[PDB]
Amino acid sequence: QLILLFSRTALTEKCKLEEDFLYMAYADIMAKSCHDEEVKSFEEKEMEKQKLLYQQARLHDRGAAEMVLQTISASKGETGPMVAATLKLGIAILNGGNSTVQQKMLDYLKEKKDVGFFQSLAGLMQSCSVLDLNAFERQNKAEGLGMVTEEGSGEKVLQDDEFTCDLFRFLQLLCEGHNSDFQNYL
Amino acid sequence: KKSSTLQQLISETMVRWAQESVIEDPELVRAMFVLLHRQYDGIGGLVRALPKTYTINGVSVEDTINLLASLGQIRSLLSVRMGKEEEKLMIRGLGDIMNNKVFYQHPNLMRALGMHETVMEVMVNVLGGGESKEITFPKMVANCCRFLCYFCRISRQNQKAMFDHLSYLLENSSVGLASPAMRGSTPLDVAAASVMDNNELALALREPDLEKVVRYLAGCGLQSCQMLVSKGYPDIGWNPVEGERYLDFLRFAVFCNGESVEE
Amino acid sequence: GVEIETISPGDGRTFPKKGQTCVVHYTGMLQNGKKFDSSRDRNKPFKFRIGKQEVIKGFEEGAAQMSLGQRAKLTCTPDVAYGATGHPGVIPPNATLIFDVELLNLE
Amino acid sequence: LSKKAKASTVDLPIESVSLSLQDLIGYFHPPDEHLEHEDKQNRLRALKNRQNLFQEEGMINLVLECIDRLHVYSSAAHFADVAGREAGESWKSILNSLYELLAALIRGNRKNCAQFSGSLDWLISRLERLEASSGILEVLHCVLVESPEALNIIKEGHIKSIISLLDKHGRNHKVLDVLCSLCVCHGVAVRSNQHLICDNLLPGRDLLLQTRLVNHVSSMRPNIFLGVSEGSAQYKKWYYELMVDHTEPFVTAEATHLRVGWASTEGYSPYPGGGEEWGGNGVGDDLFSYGFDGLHLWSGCIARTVSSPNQHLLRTDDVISCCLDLSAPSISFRINGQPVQGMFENFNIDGLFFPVVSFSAGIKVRFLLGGRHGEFKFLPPPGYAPCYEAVLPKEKLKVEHSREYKQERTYTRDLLGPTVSLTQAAFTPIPVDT
Amino acid sequence: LGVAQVGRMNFGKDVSTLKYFTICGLQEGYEPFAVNTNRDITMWLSKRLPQFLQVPSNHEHIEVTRIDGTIDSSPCLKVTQKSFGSQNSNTDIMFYRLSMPIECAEVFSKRDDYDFLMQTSTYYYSVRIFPGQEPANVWVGWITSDFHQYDTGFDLDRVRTVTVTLGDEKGKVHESIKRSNCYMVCAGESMSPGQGRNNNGLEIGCVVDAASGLLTFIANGKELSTYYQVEPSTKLFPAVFAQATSPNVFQFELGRIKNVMPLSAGLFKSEHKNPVPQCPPRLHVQFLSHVLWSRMPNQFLKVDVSRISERQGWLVQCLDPLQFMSLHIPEENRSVDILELTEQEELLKFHYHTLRLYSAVCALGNHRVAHALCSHVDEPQLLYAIENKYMPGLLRAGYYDLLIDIHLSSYATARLMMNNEYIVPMTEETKSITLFPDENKKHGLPGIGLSTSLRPRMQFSSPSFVSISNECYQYSPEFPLDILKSKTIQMLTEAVKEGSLHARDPVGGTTEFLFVPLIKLFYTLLIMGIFHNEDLKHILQLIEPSVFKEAPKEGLLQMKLPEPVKLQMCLLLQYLCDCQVRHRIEAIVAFS
Lengths: 186, 263, 107, 434, 592
Description:
Chain A is mainly α. In chain A, 59% of the residues lie in helices and 0% in strands. Chain C is mainly beta. The longest helix of chain C is centred in the middle third of the chain and has 9 residues, at 57-65. The chains are: A mainly alpha, C mainly beta. The interface between B and E is large, with 45 and 42 residues. The PDB classes it as membrane protein.
């Protein structure tokens, strides 16, 4: 029911994807429950993978593999706290190159003929931040003038590190395992 | 087996309600899962409420109560349409707030109560509903800009909080720039008070922000002031009155504490 | 002015005088017979001071003519009651007001 | 047709226009509520795109032009006079379709409802028309629910026109919803529109249904059924007496009811005629009853102030004596032995009268009927007979409820059918002619 | 039940009273009609007194046709008979009136000129007896709202009348007033020319002077001798009585004559000064019929009658107060009990949408309109509707949200506006607040305790329309908040006790009309914080007797509630958790 509500709010036509405390709260429980993170033995490594598959199957069997594609297609290329939380759940359910989730994510896209998803992916990567010399110099002068750095860590150069990393880790996970059916679809 | 706690009772009622039947109300499901999240995150309420906590002495209890009633009388004006009877109410609320000792003694309470944002969104509504058709109720924007300039002058942290809304203040920075006697009572005069004598807040200005004040001044140098030529004033090919008001904001951006910001 | 008709007699010797609050317990009606006010509905005796211009002129004159413990009917002409502007949302313009007033106490 | 060209010479599309105005309405049709969520949202997306594409071509000012050019004729007959008879036959239909299309091209689209702000003054100016009131009201509701920029043009002259529509058209709920959407929109309350609807609708108390809290009124009558008729055996003048043991002036927020007098029946029936079986109606709230309350004479639900020595509302230990004269129709009262300066005349005498008292809660009264049923405190006026002397010899005099049903537990309640007329109450000896 | 017949119906509220159910009906599976009901089933019985209602569009005899006024004509209302000439036709006098009355002046005073026309109060309507309809069977004139006399043979001599004579002390008659409910004339006797009317049907004009009460009649252009003098404020309904001896009987021409104001100008206030005759859709022909039901009251007055003595007489004793809410139709001058709207589906809906407009004109803190709604919906009206168990479901949720909007919408919203903000003074009682009440680390009841955080002030104004002060239009109108607490607690305890048995008579007719309201004034009172200590301790046991125990019954949280009832138990539990976070901020500052 929770996933269906979150997949219906995404399918509802709105001009902008509106901030939703419930969705950023339950996109970090669903994602964090699917990893639960010296040399492990073979049985330990194979048990950490079968538990991973069951924890991932707890969600994509309930429609969570189409929800992370509906919340991205409703973003329309705008970066925010809501796409940086949807891109962490897709990664969580795709970790290890989950073939079932990969097939589910491609079947939905091929069935709905969703053009919004690939237009939002292009807009989210064109809006990703890079290194800035002007901001770094303007911050270096700020520290040089002795004023207290009230802000945390000067996250104006490379404004978003984790969103940019996750947006490409998701695209890598979507093609991991040499998925020749989605490599040719991207 | 025995809950004995509101948190445990609610952590079970929600799940049982959802596992007995499929709820057909999207608003009932949404309120059914917000409350379960609150129980499972009992520390996520103390991270959201404690920032909204402030303590005062017993001597200031009555004065803080008098301030809170005035703040409520202004906050309740955000759900009604701005008019003649909301004119006097808004001005009186702003006057009582600024004629109060707590508003100066405790500037962090004033920032935790979200007073500046309330005043802005009131002014946001006023400008949006009737800006292009000249500024109806111009004694509102004047008071809402006179208060928001004292707010910046109270402390440097209030100025920093006001600086985060510079984009909108520059979006609507042609509100009353040609009407005289409205100087220091203008949305552009609130944008010049968020960087005034603050070196860090002047080193935080972005190039795109400085692109738009220049574009407005360029239009002020190519097109005349239509409101002034409708008033009968001779039609020169440029706007002197509105063009001088985009040159003092830039004066507060390139110059700080008697030294020019070279960036 | 207003004319007063006694419903129940009072003492006939105690009358409201300058500077004295009148505790009245009234019911207000329009000329067509529709009720618009009643202190009995709110269960509050109504307190007002004579000569302070805080109530309508008809009610003031009626209370002045009233006696302690008396119940009487007060007919207020529009001249001594809300005039031609009326009371917005309650009293129609140019309306005659009938009041059933009982003078409970005088302090 | 306006410039008076011959009907045959000009081509007037009537069937094709009607078919197009029926295809467009279905083309701009809101999705049904039983569809799946995805299908509903997809159809909403298509309807919104159609509405947006169907507005940029100036196609909304064309339906308006058609409406304006069709409103130049007062009625279907007026249209059919200038045009053909078949053309006038479907004038109301085309007008009703032009608003159903107009209310669908803008329904749910805030930007389409925002460009219609300049045309609401023209739209309201035709609201009084019977052929267009419903359509104009629907378009107005659709505009006002969606566009916040459309409430800013509505003035006193536009609100008083919508209010005057309820006065001239009846009690329509769809006018109250337009008035409800005029007050609050998207959580924002327009105080100017909230200070006008009240001041222009409420004070009159003539259009909206009005509510009141009224006490229950019960009526007691004795077993006596006395009337007057030609050639009968009955005494034409009678006298009974009522004196009060207790009366609380205000048991509730409303004044305590206590009325005494005479009532009459409809025909020779034993049923109190021309009144309600329950409610707040008492002795004198109809033309079948005549009552006294200590200050007024009640008959037909109109009260007239009557003079009396030390006149007052009925209190504890007050004696009321009632006199009835059926020879010359007359009902007189005497309070505490002093005559009251009022009396009824020339009322209908074709039925059976009886003493009656009506009251709300909080009284204690006692019938003084004469003889063994109560001793008179004051001497009956000369000639008048005590009311206990009208008892039919075998029956027993008893004070009972005027109406059939009383307070009791439901399965024991005696449901009474129609009662036989008391035609034997007036003994008129009529033998055979010989 | 026929003539002089007595009967009794036992629905089966108590199965012990049923004395043949076990003999035949218990084993077969049949159930009593009132097996699970908590209230007495209402009686609806055929109305004895005929009333006036609009002519149905499917009436088997009557057919009203509206004719629009041309340039040379006037608006008209034709009354015809559908089934004339055929068998089963009804040949009896039918009583017709018009839907709207004319009210005379409150105080009687003691080409047409466009000044006299603008200043006059004299109105007109005309009736054209159709040529061929017998004028001896047609009566034209005015009636009042009291006319409820349906007799097969009507004459102008048996109409109900009374003469109220008030005299001075000596007995001299200073005034004599005739009163009646039928001020009408007979067409046959008014007809002067004789026999031949087939020139044109008889035109009997009815002229009323709303400033003096003089009722005159003009037949065929000649004034008749008969006249009436009605009392001030009399509401007269244009009425025509006719026995149909023709296919088309008569008409309601609404034109005008020289120097007389048309009827629509007196009927409608908006058209007061319009000299142009009009027939707006609100004005329709009505007729006296017997097809109506009546609602027997659920409770009657307790009256004690008994012989005290021969020397005393017969004692009548009523002492316990009983009340009902009456709904008044302004255009028909009649009052109807509001509980009769359970079967009137148009008035119920119109009054519900009227209550939704009452709650909309005073929305979001309109205090000047909130005091103006205390003159239309009184406090006793806002307490009878909340408690009455026979109220219609739609009106129960309209009179219920109107109290919460007139009185409790301005302090319940402002207090929520400062709900996520904690300003706790540094006082000597603040320093005594602890996270746990005692050494045993057990949670206290959420809400009960000492809270010192700054809170908005609760201030109200006393409604009064005799006062001329303008300083009461701030703050909401005063309402008794002590009676309301106990009343709401009692109603919610009763609702929990009753609805848990799954009865067939929920208050309002549905479970969503019994609980969705009640939990919304309970929620509003809890938000306002009116409840204190013991009342909260008693209302928490109704939410959950087990969890909130202070030391088979199940609370609201276990009653299988409907979804709309479950949304307000998520708002009630949302504030009960905010009552814990605020304590968890007051207990940190004290340690701090």
